[PDB]
Amino acid sequence: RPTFYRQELNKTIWEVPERYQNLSPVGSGAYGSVCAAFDTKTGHRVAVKKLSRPFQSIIHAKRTYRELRLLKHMKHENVIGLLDVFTPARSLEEFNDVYLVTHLMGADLNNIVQKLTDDHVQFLIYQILRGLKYIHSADIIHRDLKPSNLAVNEDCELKILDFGLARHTDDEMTGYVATRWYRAPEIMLNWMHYNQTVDIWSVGCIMAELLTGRTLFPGTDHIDQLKLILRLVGTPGAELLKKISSESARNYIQSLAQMPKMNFANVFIGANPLAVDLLEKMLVLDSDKRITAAQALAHAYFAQYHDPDDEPVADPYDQSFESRDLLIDEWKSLTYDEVISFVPPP
Numbered sequence: 001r002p003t004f005y006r007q008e009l010n011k012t013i014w015e016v017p018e019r020y021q022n023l024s025p026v027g028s029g030a031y032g033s034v035c036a037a038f039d040t041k042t043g044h045r046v047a048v049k050k051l052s053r054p055f056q057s058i059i060h061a062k063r064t065y066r067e068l069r070l071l072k073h074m075k076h077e078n079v080i081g082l083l084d085v086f087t088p089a090r091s092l093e094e095f096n097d098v099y100l101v102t103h104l105m106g107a108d109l110n111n112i113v114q115k116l117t118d119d120h121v122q123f124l125i126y127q128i129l130r131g132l133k134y135i136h137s138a139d140i141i142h143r144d145l146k147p148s149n150l151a152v153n154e155d156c157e158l159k160i161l162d163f164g165l166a167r168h169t170d171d172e173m174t175g176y177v178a179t180r181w182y183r184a185p186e187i188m189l190n191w192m193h194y195n196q197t198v199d200i201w202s203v204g205c206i207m208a209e210l211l212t213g214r215t216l217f218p219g220t221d222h223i224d225q226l227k228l229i230l231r232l233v234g235t236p237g238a239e240l241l242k243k244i245s246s247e248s249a250r251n252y253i254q255s256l257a258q259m260p261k262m263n264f265a266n267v268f269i270g271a272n273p274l275a276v277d278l279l280e281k282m283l284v285l286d287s288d289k290r291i292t293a294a295q296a297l298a299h300a301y302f303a304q305y306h307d308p309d310d311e312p313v314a315d316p317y318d319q320s321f322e323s324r325d326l327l328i329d330e331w332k333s334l335t336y337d338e339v340i341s342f343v344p345p346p
């Protein structure tokens with residue numbers, strides 16, 4: 001066990017191993033607090049998050065376990081990775097606080113989206129799809145891909161962030177808000193059971209915005225956003241209408257006048273024809289028919305970067321716990337086991 005030291009950072013008591021030095025606050029929220037630090041063992045600048053109230057309810061305790069399970073699994077160049085997890089507790093009986101450590105990320109895709117060449121868009125979207133092939137191979141769905149969740153460094157290298165965090169509230173999804181502009185229509189409106197194809201819709205929205213500099217579907221509310229979507233991709237045919245299980249949602253959609261799919265070459269004026277082709281294969285209303293991440297990596301738009309021998313898949317991820325019912329202290333004991341069993345990366 002390392003030696004820990006204590007200090008108070010903006011009304012919070014932080015107790016961390018000696019290896020972490022020069023702590024300084026970076027952010028706060030309902031989730032907890034974050035500090036930047038220097039890791040003397042590895043030489044990295046790191047971000048350290050102290051969870052707030054990790055075991056205060058069954059829902060909170062299960063969420064803490066979920067976040068730790070997801071972060072411990074992710075071992076890919078284009079996905080956030082866990083550098084360390086620790087607790088000052090010396091036994092399960094005194095276990096209360098959880099600290100998570102990752103690389104310090106500077107800019108997200110907002111902080112750049114600058115003047116992006118088509119070569120920049122190729123490389124950025126290639127890296128998102130390489131990370132998604134990995135995530136999807138483990139049956140993990142992100143559900144919240146947007147520019148603020150994509151970290152980028154000075155060399156244009158990209159990582160996908162935000163796994164296992166608290167679900168977005170109803171009020172966070174209301175009105176003229178980027179928290180909804182990238183969501184697939186079937187999850188925005190609870191049309192049906194969704195699956196991993198929801199993430200490819202988000203990639204299409206991100207790629208369009210990198211090419212134009214403008215939000216693709218900046219709706220002022222759920223219904224305005226759906227109208228913007230159907231104007232571009234067309235109203236649904238009877239094939240897709242069958243698959244909408246909500247009779248109420250089906251009824252509403254049929255109340256709208258029918259519209260054909262627009263010509264994407266006239267929407268994305270001047271863009272690479274191969275980029276236009278890929279956007280048409282991502283932004284398909286029927287999720288059954290969207291291109292997958294593994295398929296999109298092989299599209300000609302990425303010929304400069306595609307290497308099928310360096311696009312790895314994930315180890316299997318057992319998420320049977322998600323359907324399991326447990327008491328607060330049982331979720332907490334499961335979390336404790338995962339803290340003490342952590343093996344740092346090479």
Ligand SMILES: NC(=O)NOCc1ccccc1
Pocket residue numbers: 034047048049067071080100101102161162163164165
């Ligand atoms: N869950 C997730 O995707 N990231 O949260 C882990 C984390 C965030 C900031 C600083 C240190 C660790």
Ligand SMILES: [Cl-]
Pocket residue numbers: 002003017018019020
């Ligand atoms: Cl130490």
Ligand SMILES: [Cl-]
Pocket residue numbers: 087088089094095096097098
């Ligand atoms: Cl503790």
Ligand SMILES: [Cl-]
Pocket residue numbers: 110146147148149178
């Ligand atoms: Cl965003």
Ligand SMILES: [Cl-]
Pocket residue numbers: 316317318319
């Ligand atoms: Cl597993």
